Scaffold this active site. Structure first.
Site, mmCIF file in Angstrom:
data_model
loop_
_atom_site.group_PDB
_atom_site.id
_atom_site.type_symbol
_atom_site.label_atom_id
_atom_site.label_comp_id
_atom_site.label_asym_id
_atom_site.label_seq_id
_atom_site.Cartn_x
_atom_site.Cartn_y
_atom_site.Cartn_z
ATOM 1 N N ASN A 78 30.891 49.410 -8.178
ATOM 2 C CA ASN A 78 31.136 48.026 -8.606
ATOM 3 C C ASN A 78 31.628 47.998 -10.043
ATOM 4 O O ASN A 78 30.842 48.105 -10.987
ATOM 5 C CB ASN A 78 29.896 47.150 -8.466
ATOM 6 C CG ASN A 78 30.131 45.737 -9.004
ATOM 7 O OD1 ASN A 78 31.263 45.230 -8.986
ATOM 8 N ND2 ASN A 78 29.072 45.100 -9.490
ATOM 9 N N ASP A 131 20.464 43.056 -10.150
ATOM 10 C CA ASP A 131 19.527 44.165 -10.217
ATOM 11 C C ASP A 131 18.838 44.268 -11.570
ATOM 12 O O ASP A 131 17.977 45.145 -11.741
ATOM 13 C CB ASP A 131 20.211 45.498 -9.859
ATOM 14 C CG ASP A 131 21.544 45.728 -10.571
ATOM 15 O OD1 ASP A 131 22.197 44.754 -11.005
ATOM 16 O OD2 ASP A 131 21.939 46.921 -10.667
ATOM 17 N N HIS A 177 23.552 41.121 -14.239
ATOM 18 C CA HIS A 177 23.614 41.225 -12.782
ATOM 19 C C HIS A 177 22.221 41.131 -12.149
ATOM 20 O O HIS A 177 21.191 41.246 -12.812
ATOM 21 C CB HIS A 177 24.277 42.527 -12.358
ATOM 22 C CG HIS A 177 25.750 42.558 -12.610
ATOM 23 N ND1 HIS A 177 26.450 43.739 -12.778
ATOM 24 C CD2 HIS A 177 26.655 41.559 -12.722
ATOM 25 C CE1 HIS A 177 27.726 43.453 -12.983
ATOM 26 N NE2 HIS A 177 27.877 42.144 -12.956
ATOM 27 N N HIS A 215 21.622 43.823 -18.502
ATOM 28 C CA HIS A 215 22.836 43.019 -18.380
ATOM 29 C C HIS A 215 22.549 41.912 -17.372
ATOM 30 O O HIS A 215 21.410 41.736 -16.929
ATOM 31 C CB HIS A 215 24.093 43.860 -18.053
ATOM 32 C CG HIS A 215 24.120 44.495 -16.694
ATOM 33 N ND1 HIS A 215 23.471 45.674 -16.400
ATOM 34 C CD2 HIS A 215 24.802 44.152 -15.571
ATOM 35 C CE1 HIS A 215 23.707 46.003 -15.142
ATOM 36 N NE2 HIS A 215 24.521 45.104 -14.621
ATOM 37 N N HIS A 257 30.062 49.261 -17.950
ATOM 38 C CA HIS A 257 29.828 48.652 -16.644
ATOM 39 C C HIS A 257 29.964 47.129 -16.694
ATOM 40 O O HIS A 257 30.468 46.506 -15.745
ATOM 41 C CB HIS A 257 28.438 49.056 -16.154
ATOM 42 C CG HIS A 257 27.950 48.255 -14.986
ATOM 43 N ND1 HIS A 257 28.277 48.561 -13.681
ATOM 44 C CD2 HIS A 257 27.135 47.175 -14.926
ATOM 45 C CE1 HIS A 257 27.696 47.693 -12.870
ATOM 46 N NE2 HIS A 257 27.014 46.832 -13.601
HETATM 47 O O1 LIG Z 1 27.227 49.798 -9.713
HETATM 48 C C1 LIG Z 1 26.148 49.170 -9.893
HETATM 49 O O2 LIG Z 1 25.562 49.230 -11.009
HETATM 50 C C2 LIG Z 1 25.534 48.334 -8.774
HETATM 51 N N1 LIG Z 1 24.432 47.614 -8.901
HETATM 52 C C3 LIG Z 1 24.188 47.022 -7.739
HETATM 53 C C4 LIG Z 1 25.188 47.412 -6.863
HETATM 54 N N2 LIG Z 1 25.990 48.218 -7.535
HETATM 55 C C5 LIG Z 1 27.188 48.861 -7.011
HETATM 56 C C6 LIG Z 1 27.905 48.365 -5.753
HETATM 57 C C7 LIG Z 1 27.980 49.806 -5.256
HETATM 58 C C8 LIG Z 1 26.994 50.222 -6.345
HETATM 59 ZN ZN LIG Z 2 25.612 45.540 -12.975
HETATM 60 ZN ZN LIG Z 3 23.639 48.124 -10.952
#
Ligand SMILES: O=C(O)c1nccn1C1CCC1
Ligand SMILES: [Zn+2]
Ligand SMILES: [Zn+2]
Ligand SMILES: [Zn+2]
Length: 231
Positions: A179, A87, A85, A83, A148
């Protein structure tokens, strides 16, 4: 044992071999004052490697390529981001500079551009409708519906019965939502049901963050998402 968040310094990357030609990669990142682990996948594709997701940042992703060269010694030729984001696409520019062909769905590419995140170059066609599945070399890519995020993909490795759920699947130790700013809470349980119905044979389930488990991670995530829905 599987490496946990407190034994990986931010900037280091660990590899965990699940099966012949299948690994997860584990990194850590500091976010909002806490340190989080983050998983991705590596799948051998003949003499090359397929990478699923970055290691959450350019610095971690450079270390990821270094650890792959050290511990595996095969070239990463393609990468898929599950996705939009950071990460998952943070580090795409590092990958592209190293000669990796980076891929994501058109939805993910559109959302990454809007967000100001790195944009994988190639587009994954055939995944725009919930329940859509496409083959991508040694894996199957599956769009289960919004969860998500509206664009989240999951990845299945048929040779190893490994299901990478990405951030749509929570590890057991996570008992509160986290999140969900980009989430579809109303659809997330239904999307998880589609995963269960499509990969009921999965043996090894990898969440976006934390320890792998079995298909019980799907029930766990549904439980946690519904509790958040009700509070
Ligand atoms: O929920 C996620 O997938 C995520 N990725 C990076 C940060 N997070 C959240 C924020 C608290 C965990
Ligand atoms: Zn994400
Ligand atoms: Zn994440
Ligand atoms: Zn649980």
């Amino acid at each position: 044992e599987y490496p946990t968040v407190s034994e990986i310094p931010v900037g280091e990357v660990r590899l965990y071999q699940i099966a012949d030609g299948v690994w997860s990669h584990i990194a850590t990142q500091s976010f909002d004052g806490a340190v989080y682990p983050s998983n991705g996948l590596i799948v051998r594709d003949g003499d090359e490697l397929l990478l699923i997701d970055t290691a959450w940042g350019a610095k971690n992703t450079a270390a990821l390529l270094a650890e792959i060269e050290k511990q595996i010694g095969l070239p990463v030729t393609r990468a898929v981001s599950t996705h939009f984001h950071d990460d998952r696409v943070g580090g795409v520019d590092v990958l592209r500079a190293a000669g990796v062909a980076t891929y994501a769905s058109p939805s993910t590419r559109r959302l990454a551009e809007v967000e100001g995140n790195e944009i994988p170059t190639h587009s994954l066609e055939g995944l725009s409708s919930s329940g859509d599945a496409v083959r991508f070399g040694p894996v199957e890519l599956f769009y289960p519906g919004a969860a998500h995020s509206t664009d989240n993909l999951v990845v299945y490795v048929p040779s190893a019965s490994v299901l990478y759920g990405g951030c749509a699947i929570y590890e057991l130790s996570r008992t509160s939502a986290g999140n969900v700013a980009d989430a579809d809470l109303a659809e997330w349980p239904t999307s998880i049901e589609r995963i269960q119905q499509h990969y009921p044979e999965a043996q090894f389930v990898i969440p976006g963050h934390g320890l792998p488990g079995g298909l019980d991670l799907l029930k766990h995530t549904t439980n946690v998402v519904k509790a958040h829905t009700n509070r």
